[PDB]
Design a binder for this molecule. Structure first.
Ligand SMILES: [Cl-]
Ligand SMILES: [Cl-]
Length: 290
């Protein structure tokens, strides 16, 4: 029944988005609402098993069975979902903020899934509430995490994000040792989206640049506290900005639709949906004049 895609010619985008926003977002809200049930036929039965409650930060925010990431061994559960790319599977892994009791699991998944890049879009504490464990080392002294050894090589604080590099080694499969880059966006507001489009556009472009210069990146891990709206907004913006560099139409609706198929709450508020439109708007406004 419902639309899976709403492509807009770039030359029409400014007017499209104005029309969507007219009459207090009348049409924007109607469009957003058409996405409401996408993916929602899918079960999370494994995530709900009695063994796994402690492994979920939030008991009501769970991976679908069909797209969950599995750990090797006798207890395969982690709160994490695969997101396919346009050209190949497993472009992204979306996950929750690791718990003290799941941080070893997190690094095991990183190792086993050949991940080279992690994007974190939450602070560890927000508004007095714990949102994520500090699941990486506090300094440059090496530490075991389960069967893995980790050592932080650098930690670089920038105005709106912090970039860390780690050495990691686990049981040898496709590699025997690895460098991990971690991109920590530190300024997402406590309720609402970033104040500027520029900030997240530049964060997404920076991460994408680092990924693209890797000889082999693996899936990119993206997490907030729950692996929900902020993470989905990040990934959607990555897709949308690449679209603007390749095609003469942009499909924000489709980008969000595609994410919702694979995990609950991928772009979770109308405000995030609006923000994605504002980002596209602003890029196109600039380009029109250059
Ligand atoms: Cl996939
Ligand atoms: Cl791809």
């Amino acid at each position: 029944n419902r639309k899976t895609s709403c492509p807009i010619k770039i030359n029409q985008f400014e007017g499209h988005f104005m029309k969507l926003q007219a009459d207090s977002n009348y049409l924007l809200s109607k469009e957003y609402e058409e996405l409401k049930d996408v993916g929602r036929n899918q079960s999370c039965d494994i995530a709900l098993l009695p063994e796994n409650r402690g492994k979920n930060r939030y008991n009501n925010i769970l991976p679908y069975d069909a797209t969950r990431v599995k750990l090797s061994g006798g207890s395969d559960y982690i709160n994490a979902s695969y997101i396919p790319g346009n050209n190949f599977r497993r472009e992204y892994i979306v996950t929750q903020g690791p718990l003290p009791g799941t941080k070893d699991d997190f690094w095991k998944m990183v190792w086993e899934q050949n991940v080279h890049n992690i994007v974190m879009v939450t602070q560890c504490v927000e508004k007095g509430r714990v949102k994520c464990d500090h699941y990486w080392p506090a300094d440059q002294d090496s530490l075991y995490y389960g069967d893995l050894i980790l050592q932080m090589l650098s930690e670089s604080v920038l105005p709106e994000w912090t970039i860390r590099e780690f050495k990691i080694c686990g049981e040898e499969q496709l590699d025997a040792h690895r460098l991990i880059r971690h991109f920590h966006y530190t300024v997402w507001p406590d309720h609402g989206v970033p104040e500027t489009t520029q900030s997240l556009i530049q964060f997404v472009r920076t991460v994408r640049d680092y990924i693209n210069r890797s000889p082999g990146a693996g899936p990119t891990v993206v997490h907030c506290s729950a692996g929900v709206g902020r993470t989905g907004t990040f990934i959607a913006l990555d897709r949308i900005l690449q679209q603007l560099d390749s095609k003469d139409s942009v499909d924000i609706y489709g980008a969000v639709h595609d994410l919702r198929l694979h995990r609950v709450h991928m772009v979770q508020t109308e405000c995030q949906y609006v923000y994605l439109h504002q980002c596209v708007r602003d890029v196109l406004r600039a380009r029109k004049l250059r």
